[PDB]
Design a protein around this ligand. Structure first.
Ligand SMILES: NC(=O)c1ccc(-c2cnn3ccc(NCc4cccnc4)nc23)cc1
Ligand SMILES: NC(=O)c1ccc(-c2cnn3ccc(NCc4cccnc4)nc23)cc1
Lengths: 292, 292
């Protein structure tokens, strides 16, 4: 089937550019396990012409991996090979011979944005620090949108915080190319959490840059609430009726009228009425210069 | 889409037979979290005409549930409503109004068969105890096969051990009706662990009772090894080439020639060359009466 073809094609791919010797890679503690698979902290000797050990993250299959998970790992390798932007996490290489498939990723010191924000208050962050975070993520998404990639899984848990508090978009297992159609559509049910999905993704299984814009809005709410839980205390099965009847999340505490206006615009029923990421970045730039 | 229809249809379904009052249900400790969702230990007042509290398991959505997980919970409710066999875990009811979807299940004291076996040795189990376990599971599968249900996810982790060491087949989130076609086929990649999938499921996405027979064979190996890890130390992406080139798991230690013959028969390339569950039960009955 489609996966057997990908596995065989990948297993014979003689790509010295990406192939890294397993013996030069040492694995350490688990950083996280979820839908994104298993991520461990690791160190790589003589990675990408750099003398000595480089600290890296290694993504790999969890115990008892399904075709779904294997397909997502190979998909991510294929996407990240072609991506290069300071606000997207980098692939450095892979080990695909004489052991499990390992993807070697750029290390982000502070871990997930959700973790970073929940650890903090107002660590002390200003509204300007938050607008900066959102802007950095908007820039990366503008680049991905230009590359005709829909991430599909934009959320605070899928943003990494690297040295200098630099946002890195992460978890490309569900990301899809849309050069052909400017939309990605699947018959089967998606694996993106309901509470981050656009109304047209949830009802009609339609994924576009503008459904990424919806997700960014939920991410904005997560950022403004310092890692709040979206639609708190509302079961996910209620999101069908809630969204369809025109309901959205209330303006949260410590949120400007302008900032909440941006969230609401990201959650317009009609995808074409939503801003594009370039607009979002301009709206965030404007908030920054006006002062926090 | 298909899920919005299921959610709305289910949310208006006036089924007093299955609907249980939320106020009569008290949730306790988490028993497990995985692909099957979240399962908690609980107690139900005046369940199914029984006076007082009954100890039960409650299945519910994990944090940040996807459409996939919600679809699987509703699918399981629909399947277990129509199933009744002493070696299949029972649905007792559901809470679907004024809070999250909760499925109320029969409680199995000893938890997973994988856990039970790994906890034990030769707790002391005989080859007769193991053949009994396998037989009980074969009987339940014969009943499901007759009902035109393909489980798809048969493994030691998805068998429960109840009072009297009675096997209960569990985790019906991935089970599908095949009355129409005698096969279930999906375009997208499945969420069954690779190492339990039949070769025709893995390559061609074809699920039948005979692919359940393949899975039962891996379960037999799990039972005989007291919860071993199938194809140990072999990455799941190697299973394509391994299975296609005619390789299968070696006869494990403390396994009869007859018992291993049954495993191999369950893993024949050609589904029609595999035994049916009725045959499997007869082969296990024969081993029992001959003596352990
Ligand atoms: N391509 C990828 O998906 C990916 C994922 C994670 C990493 C990664 C790099 N440094 N680092 C530090 C902590 C950490 N904690 C688990 C986590 C957090 C957020 C999101 N996922 C996992 N992860 C990391 C790098 C790449
Ligand atoms: N319909 C269902 O899928 C289901 C699942 C689990 C239960 C359930 C009943 N008693 N009990 C005790 C322990 C336990 N531990 C988690 C576990 C173990 C095996 C498999 N899954 C979860 N689970 C249970 C009942 C029904």
């Amino acid at each position: 089937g489609p996966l057997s073809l990908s596995v065989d094609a990948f297993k014979i791919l003689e790509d010295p550019k990406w192939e890294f010797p397993r013996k030069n890679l040492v694995l350490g503690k688990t950083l996280g396990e979820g839908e994104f698979g298993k991520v461990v902290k690791a160190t790589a000797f003589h990675l990408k012409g750099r003398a000595g050990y480089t600290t890296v993250a290694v993504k790999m299959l969890k115990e008892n991996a399904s075709p779904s998970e294997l397909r997502d790992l190979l998909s991510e390798f294929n996407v990240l090979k072609q991506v290069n932007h300071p606000h997207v996490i980098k692939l450095y290489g892979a080990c695909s011979q004489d052991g499990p498939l390992l993807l070697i990723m750029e290390y982000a010191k502070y871990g997930s944005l959700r973790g970073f924000l929940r650890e903090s208050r107002k660590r002390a962050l200003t509204m300007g620090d938050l607008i900066s975070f959102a802007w950095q993520i908007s820039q990366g998404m503008q680049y991905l949108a230009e590359m005709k990639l829909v991430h599909r899984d934009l959320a605070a848990r899928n943003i990494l915080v690297a040295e200098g508090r630099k946002m890195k978009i992460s978890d490309f297992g569900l990301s899809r190319d849309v050069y052909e159609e400017d939309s990605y559509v699947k018959r089967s049910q998606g694996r993106i959490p309901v509470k981050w999905m656009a109304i047209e993704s949830l009802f009609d299984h339609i994924y576009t840059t503008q459904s990424d814009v919806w997700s960014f809005g939920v991410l904005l709410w997560e950022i403004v609430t310092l890692g709040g839980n979206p639609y708190p205390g509302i079961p996910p099965e209620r999101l069908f009726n809630l969204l369809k009847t025109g309901h959205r999340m209330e303006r949260p505490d410590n949120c400007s009228e302008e900032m909440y206006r941006l969230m609401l615009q990201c959650w317009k029923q009609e995808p074409d009425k939503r801003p594009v990421f370039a607009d979002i970045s301009k709206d965030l730039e404007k908030m920054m210069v006006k002062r926090r």
